Design a protein around this nucleic acid. Structure first.
Lengths: 48, 52, 70, 130, 117, 94, 125, 120
RNA sequence: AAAACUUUCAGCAACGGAUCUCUUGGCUCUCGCAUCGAUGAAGAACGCAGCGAAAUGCGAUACGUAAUGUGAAUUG
RNA sequence: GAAGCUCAGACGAGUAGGCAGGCGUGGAGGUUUGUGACGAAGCCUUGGGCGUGAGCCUGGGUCGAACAGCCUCUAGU
RNA sequence: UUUCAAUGGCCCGUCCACGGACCAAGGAGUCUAGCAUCUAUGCGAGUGUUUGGGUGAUGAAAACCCAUCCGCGAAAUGAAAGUGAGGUGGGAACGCCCUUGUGGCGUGCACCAUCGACCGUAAGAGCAUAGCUGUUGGGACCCGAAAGAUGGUGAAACCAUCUAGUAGCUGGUUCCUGCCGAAGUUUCCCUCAGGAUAGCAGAAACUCAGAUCAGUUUUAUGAGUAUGUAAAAUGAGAGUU
RNA sequence: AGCUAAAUAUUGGCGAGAGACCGAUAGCGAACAAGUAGAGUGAUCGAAAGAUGAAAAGAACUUUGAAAAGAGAGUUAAAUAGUACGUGAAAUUGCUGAAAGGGAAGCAUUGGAAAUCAG
């Protein structure tokens, strides 16, 4: 599993590293994300 | 790791949740077409845009 | 719209503006002095009770619990 | 149908890979697979793990669609399946108890012409009221 | 390849001339005895797909360049590749200060400006 | 979606729940299946079919041959002998 | 961001409140900044205008002019400063009003009522 | 994940570099070589590429690799050319000989009109 | 084939008040609260400012009085 | 732009109905380092250009403060 | 652009008749509940968090998390007690040959059949959501009819409500281009209006590369120049649920 | 025979905070002196009407006119902002210029004449 560098406040790469979480290998579905977000972006409307 | 989990191990912060497994294993079709295992069996290619 | 609310729309008398709304109206604690010192004016009551070691309810919680760490 | 009805970008990759194979080999397996990728969800019914186990003991098994699990049957044989999707229970049962699971992109790497592969299908009845 | 336009005159809605309430814009008639819909003699001509122009010479000005609408100078930088086939057209609301910046930039890049004036 | 409608393209034109023996072994936890099924142990499992949502057991399916105790409010006549050759007994709830 | 439910960020209600402000509230909307030498030795940033205060007009066609305020014309949010005027057609001189935010204060009208306020608003005198 | 799944997201319809016109579309990205929404052109879509641009009477070529494609700070490697026009044509094409040479035409074409812009 | 008259085209002017931009108003939702009157209420009529007819406020103490607060106005 | 490119052949009326692809309208999310007092929107014109078309872009005039292309969401379109 | 000449061109919508003096703005298949089909997405013998509880400091009516239940499905059948579950043929794909192939040979998913059994079961396929379309009910595409009811005000009439009352009917119903394209009639059922099955028009899923069809004619007739029937010419890819 | 919190309802009252709402034929009947002008014996009914400009700086003065007003001026960034006041469409009308017209016009195709534009 790959690692990713951790950045200090100044910008220097710290010695520590974390392994990339499995979620970053999840499928990328621009068709699904729009279908969900179309309805979820509707759930704060006020009636008129 | 616990907010989302893994495709084979349940997430800790979401119950009975495993990540969605990909429909396709490898996401490189253009490499799949241009790989040996297919290029060895594929019959001879036709021509490109064909003369009138 | 009602004549009554048209009265103070066409009147010159200033309203009775009453300034009341508070987002997160988390009521502060009186009663016991010990708990009132060691209350968290931000965290919720069921967090605060479990922080102190006090059972918020003896009966089962009719929903979910809070799990922040595995 | 010239293209699938799904906006699944990953499906269009399978079709693109298997549109190349359909016209560039004589494999009637490829033409059958490409056509079945076009068919709707109602026409790609699920097959069960048990049914696959029966059909192999009655070679990589190929089913376009889903492979669900059969809880009634307990000890799963060794199998090599290649399907569009797998239910989580079915995938664990095939993988832990014996063989391995594949996918239609991997299966093309394995058998581009479909040699030594059985192309199964699931009972296309749905409800079928009468 | 040159340009040939299969028809120059526009299409005018029937009786558009007679009435000011009837617009000068084409609406297809729906009457079942409409001489215009039944394409009689000396009647107005209905648009058909047969009138469509040549694909290789479509959306082309009589000087063989397709008009690309330009709002700022960063749009003219896009026509860098296609100076030989696209003509830069200034948007109608671009101020005088920006307009000269675009025209001077287009002149440097060799991109024709349809409305340089 | 009032943009994709047909009026848009028309502008201008005029109590005994049932369980069966095949499913019977699934009601027990997956862990204890791996230590009671296929192993010859003196202790037999208890499958309290009542405490899963069924009152009756039916005779569908075949039986793994491990003697098993099944707790039911009701049992089919051809369900109970099928577990008999399986070595187990039906235990009836009062 | 106004994190409070106490205050309204409606545009409609903010304009009604500005244009329905009573004189005892218009008196605050008519504040003016303090000039640099006033600002540093009183440690205060602004002040509501008062008659007889000496101001210099910062912005407008009367830029750089000075003068004394004659009357803080509160109904129309205007300040009438002496010896700044516009000439009417017939020959009369009708002063025009400058806004209290477009003028800076270079000399105050100190009174015991103002002195308490200056030390009230974190100042020194 | 890889070049084709990224293509069907950044490339096909929605990007921050696309300009759809009367009947077609352009590609505003600076690192493009044709200005069009094409796979052989779009870097967001594809792996290693090469294209040239103009700065203050000077030309510069940008290059990228695959091992470094995940680290965007130093992902692009720039080379500055301030010697001559015909030299620039040779300085560019020489560095892309080990590279697929289908887009050498587009690269060489770009230098010419960049040079022509400097003259005009 | 002249002028007028009629018609069309263009320019200007008229008429008219569309379009656009605005907007201390509407409508809809949510939130908080419970407080009219025989100690004369709701409503009605008359009346009052230096100059007010409307509207507001107010009651022969009449565009108010006392008290507290602010701290120099009101404005035609 | 694999939704692409290329070669070839045939066919073209059309009511009821069936079928796909587009043009314009008010608002919403995203985007364009987007347009604008050096003149936004509108409006006008014997000015020009584009599309078979719905429509679009533009010159000049008038005008004075906001508007739009693209991907999508929504309708008192 | 305007005018001129040559040829042409009945006024539009509606059902002769009815509507139309002219212009600008407004103006009609909408929202919603249930059901049905289809496509997509998520999961899969399961599925659905949003009645609630938890949580959310930054737009806290959003997002995020979850306990017990419950809905539908996982088993039917009888009115009810009660009870309660294959091999043959083809056939998609693969292997295999002889040496191509053909053909043979295996393998046989779906499904179709025959031929078998078990009480419908036979190795479960659904559940939710969004979209499209159809239909039923709500004012229900827009406008429009004669009455009535309540409670009032005058001296039966009048007034505000019920009330957007009632429509089998009248009139109107707003953008473009493209593709395909009818029947205009048998059939029956049918007190009543209709309902039909079929035909014509389509959309999806599956067989043979056919001698399968044909608004055609032949061949052979049989009987009375015609008539029907079965069995070569010609064209076409014909089919089916 | 009797009482009783909370959870629950809330187009009215006293206030607030919003909105994928409407934008002056819309939205409440009423954005404005609106339940107002007004109508009816009465019960009831019931409208239309928003925008000068940054600031009135609302046009001094002369002249013609009895007056209304006009013409000069003057204010302004602008009077193509003059209170009949942002923008100022169409119908409709007046003048000017061009053109055609013998009991129709309008339109269509093709070209000439004049006008005008481009490349």
């Amino acid at each position: 599993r790959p690692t990713v560098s951790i950045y200090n406040k100044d910008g220097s790469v710290s010695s520590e590293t974390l392994a990339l979480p499995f979620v970053f290998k999840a499928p990328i579905r621009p068709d699904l994300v729009r279908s969900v977000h179309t309805a979820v972006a509707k759930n704060k409307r006020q009636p008129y | 790791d616990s907010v989302f989990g893994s495709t084979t191990e349940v997430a800790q912060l979401k119950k009975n949740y495993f990540l969605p497994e990909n429909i396709i294993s490898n996401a490189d079709v253009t490499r799949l077409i241009n790989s040996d295992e297919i290029q060895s069996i594929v019959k001879a290619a036709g021509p490109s845009r064909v003369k009138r | 719209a009602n004549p009554r609310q048209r009265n103070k729309q066409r009147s010159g008398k200033p309203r009775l503006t009453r300034r009341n709304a508070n987002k997160k109206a988390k009521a502060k604690i009186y009663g016991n002095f010990v708990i009132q010192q060691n209350w968290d004016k931000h965290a919720t009551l069921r967090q605060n009770y479990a922080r102190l070691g006090l059972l918020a309810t003896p009966n089962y919680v009719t929903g979910g619990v809070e799990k922040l760490y595995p | 149908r010239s293209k699938p009805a799904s906006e699944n970008v990953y499906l269009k990759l399978l079709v693109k890979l298997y549109r190349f194979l359909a016209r560039r080999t004589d494999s009637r397996f490829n033409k059958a697979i490409l056509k079945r990728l076009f068919q709707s969800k109602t026409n790609r019914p699920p097959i069960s793990i048990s049914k696959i186990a029966a059909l192999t003991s009655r070679k990589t098994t190929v089913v376009v669609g889903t492979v669900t699990d059969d809880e009634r049957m307990l000890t799963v044989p060794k199998l090599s399946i290649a399907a569009l999707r797998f239910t989580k229970s079915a995938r664990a049962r095939i993988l832990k108890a014996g063989g391995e699971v594949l996918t239609l992109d991997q299966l093309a790497l394995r058998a581009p012409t479909g040699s030594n592969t059985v192309l199964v299908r699931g009972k296309k009845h749905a409800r079928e009221a009468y | 390849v040159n340009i040939i336009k299969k028809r120059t005159k526009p299409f005018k809605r029937h009786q558009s001339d007679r009435f000011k309430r009837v617009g000068e814009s084409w609406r297809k008639p729906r009457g079942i005895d409409s001489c215009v819909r039944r394409r009689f003699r000396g009647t107005i001509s209905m648009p058909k797909i047969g009138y469509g122009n040549n694909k290789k010479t479509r959306y082309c000005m009589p000087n063989g360049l397709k008009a690309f609408l330009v709002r700022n100078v960063s749009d003219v930088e896009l026509l860098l590749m296609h100076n030989k086939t696209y003509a830069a057209e200034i948007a109608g609301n671009v101020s005088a200060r920006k307009r000269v910046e675009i025209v001077e930039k287009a002149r440097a890049l060799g991109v024709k400006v349809t409305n340089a004036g | 979606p009032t943009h994709v409608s047909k009026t848009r393209k028309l502008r201008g034109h005029v109590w005994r729940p049932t369980v069966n023996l095949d499913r019977l072994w699934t009601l027990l936890p997956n862990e204890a299946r791996d230590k009671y099924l296929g192993k010859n142990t003196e202790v037999a499992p208890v499958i309290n079919v009542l405490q899963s949502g069924y009152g009756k057991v039916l005779g569908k399916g075949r039986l793994p041959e491990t003697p098993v105790i099944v707790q039911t409010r009701y049992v089919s006549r051809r369900a109970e002998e099928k577990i008999k050759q399986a070595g187990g007994v039906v235990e009836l709830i009062a | 961001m106004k994190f409070s439910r106490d205050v309204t960020s409606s545009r409609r209600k903010q304009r009604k409140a500005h244009f329905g402000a009573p004189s005892s509230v218009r008196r605050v909307l008519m504040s003016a900044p303090l000039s640099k030498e006033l600002r540093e030795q009183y440690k205060i940033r602004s002040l509501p205008v008062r008659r007889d205060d000496q101001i210099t007009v910062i912005r407008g066609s009367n830029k750089g002019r000075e003068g004394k305020i004659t009357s803080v014309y509160r109904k129309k949010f205007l300040l009438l400063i002496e010896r700044v005027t516009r000439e009417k057609a017939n020959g009369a001189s009708a002063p025009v009003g400058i806004d209290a935010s477009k003028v800076v204060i270079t000399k105050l009208h100190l009174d015991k009522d103002r002195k308490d306020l200056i030390v009230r608003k974190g100042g020194k005198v | 994940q890889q070049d084709e799944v990224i293509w069907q997201v950044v490339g096909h319809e929605f990007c921050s570099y696309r300009i759809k016109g009367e009947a077609q579309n352009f590609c505003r990205n600076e690192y493009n070589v044709t200005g069009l929404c094409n796979r052989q052109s779009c870097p967001l879509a594809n792996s290693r590429y090469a294209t040239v641009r103009e700065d203050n009477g000077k030309l510069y070529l940008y290059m990228k690799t695959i091992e470094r494609a995940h680290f965007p700070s130093k992902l692009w490697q720039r080379i500055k050319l301030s010697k001559n026009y015909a030299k620039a044509l040779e300085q560019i094409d020489q560095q892309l000989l080990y590279w697929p040479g289908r887009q050498i035409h587009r690269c060489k074409q770009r230098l010419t009109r960049l040079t022509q812009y400097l003259l005009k």
